[PDB]
C-alpha cells in the first residue's frame, strides 16, 4: 500500500535513532506540554499484564522499562521519548497490588489512579494519539475491566486492544479466537482492533508480532498529518500541540476527584459491592458501639458517619467516612491544584478563624498562665540557630497571582478574547477548541517560559544561589 | 537592659567592617567554636535518627549480626548452584544415552 | 571596574545571605540545562 509503506519506513527511521526516559508525571499540572509536546501513545491495563514489558521491548532495553513479577512496579505516568518524535506513556495498573508493601499505600495508589484517569480524559483530543488497552491472555473479564470500559465510553475515547502473554496460548488459534470472542461479547463491537503480541526484552527471538506494534503506533501518530511532506520525518517532528485551557482542566478535576480513586484490594468485587460492604459494616458498628449511641444524629452528620457527593468512574457514590485522612492530606499536598491553593489562602475564612480561635488560648490573650522558669534568651538564640541552620526549618512564602486579571476578569489581560485577530481567512473561524495543533513548538516554544512545572532543577525555594536558609 | 539600650559599644576596625562585621575575629572565633560544636552534636543525632539507629552503622544494630562480613575476599559463587543430576561434565564416568 | 551584581554586597552580607564568592566565578561546571 502507498501509505502503509511510507509509515513503515517512517516508523523504522524514527525508532532507529534511540530513546530515553523523559519525565514521570504524578500531578496534572506537571505534564510534558511545552518544548516537549510530542504526539503521545499510552498503554493502560490491569496490573501485571505486560505494559512495562511491552514498553521495554519496543525501546529495546530491558533495564530502561522496569518490569517485575510483583504488582505495583509502575505507580505514575512514565513518559518515554522515542527518536525525539513520539512519546510512549507507561501507566500504573488499575487493580489490587499484592506483594507491594510500600508505605502510604492508599495515598500512593489514589495518586496513581488520579493522574491516570484525569490525563486520559483531558488529553484524549491530543497529543494522546492512541490508547492501547493491554489485557492478559487467558484472564477472564473482571470488574476492573468493566470500570475501564465505562470510563472510555463516557469520555468517548477510541482505544485499541493488545492481548499480551501470547505465549500462554502456545499457538492455539482456537483459544485465541474464543478469547477475542469473549472480548467482543463484553465490548459489544466487532470492528474494534485487536493485536496479540508477546514481549521479551531479554531475548529477541522469543518476541512475536512485536515489530507490527511500532508500525501501528506510528500510524495513529501520523493520522493528523495531511500532506506527504508532513508524513516525512521532518513533518512529524514539527507536529506539536497546544496546552489545555483552564475551563476544561478544571472540569475534569471536578468530575474526577482524588478521593474517588479507592479500589478494593481484590479484583473480583465491584465498586458497588465494595461501597456496600462499607455501609453494612459501619451500620453494625454504630448500633453496637456504646459511644456511638452517645452521639446525636446531627453530630453523626458532622462526623460523616450516618451519611458534594463524590462519584467514582462507574458513577457510584462514596461516603466521606470511606476516604482515609492520608488521601485528604495527599490532595491538599499536590502542588498546582485547587486544594493546595485553598489550604494556603484559606478553605473557609469564617470557619477556620473560629476553629483556630477555639483551639488556642484566645484571640486577644497574650502571655497567659494556665489555671519553674521560662526559656532564656541564650537558649532561644541557640535553638533558633539549630532550627535554621541544622534542622533546615524555614517559613512559608506567598503565592503570586496575575494582577491584570485579578483586578478585572473580563478584560483582555485575562484572556478569552472572543474576537478574531486574523483577518482574511475562512478556516480560523471553524478551527476552535481548548487544545489545537501548533507546528514547531518543540523548537520555538510559546515565548519566554516554555517548560511546565517540575521540569527544571533548582527552582523556587530550592535555589543554589544563596543557600537553603536564605530561601 | 543597659548593655543593649544604654551603652555605647565601639566597633572593631570600621574600615574592614564589611568583612568581620564590626566584631573582633578572635571573639568571633570563640563564638563560632561554641556554636559549631553544639551544631555538630545536634547534627550527629539528627543524622543517626534519619538513617535509623546509628549514623555510620544505620539500621544494622550492634547486637544483631556482624558489621563487616567480608574479611579480605569472599566468593559469591556457590558450588553446584544449578542442582544438575550429573555435574561432572558433559561426559564423565558412565556414558549417557546411546551414541550417535 | 566590575560587572557582577553582588559587588554592592560586601563579604559580610554575602556570607550572611549564603552567596558564594562572585569573584571566584568558576565556569568549568556547566549549567543544569534540560537535556
Amino acid at each position: 500500500s502507498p501509505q502503509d509503506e511510507l509509515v513503515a519506513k517512517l516508523s523504522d527511521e524514527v525508532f532507529s535513532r534511540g530513546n530515553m526516559h523523559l519525565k514521570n508525571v504524578d500531578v496534572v499540572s506537571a505534564l510534558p506540554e511545552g518544548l516537549h509536546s510530542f504526539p503521545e501513545v499510552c498503554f493502560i491495563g490491569k496490573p501485571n499484564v505486560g505494559k512495562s514489558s511491552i514498553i521495554s521491548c519496543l525501546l529495546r532495553n530491558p533495564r530502561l522499562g522496569r518490569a517485575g513479577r510483583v504488582r505495583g512496579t509502575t505507580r505514575l505516568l512514565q513518559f518515554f521519548n522515542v527518536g525525539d518524535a513520539l512519546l510512549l506513556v507507561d501507566t500504573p495498573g488499575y487493580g489490587g497490588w499484592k506483594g507491594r508493601h510500600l508505605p502510604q499505600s492508599v495515598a500512593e495508589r489514589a495518586s496513581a489512579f488520579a493522574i491516570l484517569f484525569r490525563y486520559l480524559a483531558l488529553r484524549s483530543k491530543g497529543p494522546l494519539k492512541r490508547v492501547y488497552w493491554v489485557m492478559e491472555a487467558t484472564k477472564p473479564v473482571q470488574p476492573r475491566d468493566e470500570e475501564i470500559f465505562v470510563f472510555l465510553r463516557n469520555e468517548q475515547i477510541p482505544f485499541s486492544i493488545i492481548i499480551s502473554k501470547l505465549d500462554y496460548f502456545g499457538g492455539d488459534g482456537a483459544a485465541l479466537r474464543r478469547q477475542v470472542e469473549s472480548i467482543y461479547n463484553f465490548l459489544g463491537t466487532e470492528d474494534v482492533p485487536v493485536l496479540g503480541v508477546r514481549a521479551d526484552s531479554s531475548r529477541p527471538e522469543r518476541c512475536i508480532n512485536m515489530t507490527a506494534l511500532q508500525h501501528d503506533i506510528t500510524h495513529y501518530c501520523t493520522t493528523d498529518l495531511v500532506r506527504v511532506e508532513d508524513l516525512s520525518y521532518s513533518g512529524l517532528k514539527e507536529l506539536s500541540y497546544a496546552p489545555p485551557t483552564f475551563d476544561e482542566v478544571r472540569a475534569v478535576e471536578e468530575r474526577y476527584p482524588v478521593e474517588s480513586f479507592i479500589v478494593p484490594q481484590d479484583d473480583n468485587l465491584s465498586l458497588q459491592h465494595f461501597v456496600s460492604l462499607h455501609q453494612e459494616a459501619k451500620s453494625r458498628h454504630l448500633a453496637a458501639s456504646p459511644m456511638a449511641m452517645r452521639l446525636s444524629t446531627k453530630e453523626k452528620l458532622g462526623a460523616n458517619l450516618i451519611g458534594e457527593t463524590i462519584r467514582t468512574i462507574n458513577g457510584v457514590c462514596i461516603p466521606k467516612s470511606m476516604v482515609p485522612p492520608s488521601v485528604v492530606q495527599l490532595a491538599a499536598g499536590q502542588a498546582g491544584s485547587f486544594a493546595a491553593f485553598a489550604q494556603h489562602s484559606g478553605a473557609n475564612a469564617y470557619e477556620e478563624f473560629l476553629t483556630g480561635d477555639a483551639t488556642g488560648s484566645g484571640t486577644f490573650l497574650e502571655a497567659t498562665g494556665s489555671e519553674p522558669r521560662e526559656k532564656s534568651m541564650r537558649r532561644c538564640a541557640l535553638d533558633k540557630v539549630l532550627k535554621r541552620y541544622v534542622a533546615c526549618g524555614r517559613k512559608q512564602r506567598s503565592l503570586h497571582m496575575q494582577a491584570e486579571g485579578y483586578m478585572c476578569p473580563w478584560l483582555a489581560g485575562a484572556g478569552q478574547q472572543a474576537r478574531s485577530a486574523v483577518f482574511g481567512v475562512t478556516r480560523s473561524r471553524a478551527h476552535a477548541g481548548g487544545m489545537e495543533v501548533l507546528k514547531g513548538l518543540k523548537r520555538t516554544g510559546f515565548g519566554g517560559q516554555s517548560y511546565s512545572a517540575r521540569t527544571m532543577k533548582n527552582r523556587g525555594r530550592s535555589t543554589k544561589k544563596t543557600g537553603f536558609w536564605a530561601a | 537592659y543597659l548593655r543593649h539600650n544604654a551603652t555605647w559599644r565601639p566597633l572593631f576596625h570600621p574600615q574592614t567592617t564589611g568583612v568581620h562585621g564590626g566584631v573582633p575575629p578572635r571573639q568571633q572565633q570563640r563564638v563560632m567554636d561554641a556554636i559549631t560544636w553544639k551544631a555538630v552534636c545536634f547534627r550527629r543525632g539528627l543524622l543517626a535518627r534519619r538513617k535509623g539507629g546509628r549514623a555510620k552503622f544505620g539500621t544494622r544494630a550492634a547486637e544483631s549480626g556482624v558489621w563487616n562480613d567480608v574479611g579480605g575476599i569472599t566468593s559469591r559463587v556457590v558450588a553446584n548452584m544449578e542442582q544438575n543430576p550429573h555435574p561432572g561434565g558433559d561426559d564423565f564416568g558412565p556414558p549417557r544415552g546411546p551414541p550417535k | 571596574p566590575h560587572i557582577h551584581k553582588y559587588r554592592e554586597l560586601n563579604r559580610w552580607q554575602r556570607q550572611a545571605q549564603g552567596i558564594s564568592k562572585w569573584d571566584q566565578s568558576h565556569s568549568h561546571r556547566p549549567l543544569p540545562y534540560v537535556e
Partner: peptide
Amino acid sequence: IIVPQQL
C-alpha cells in the same frame, strides 16, 4: 554543615 558568622 554550614553555619554563618552569627555575632
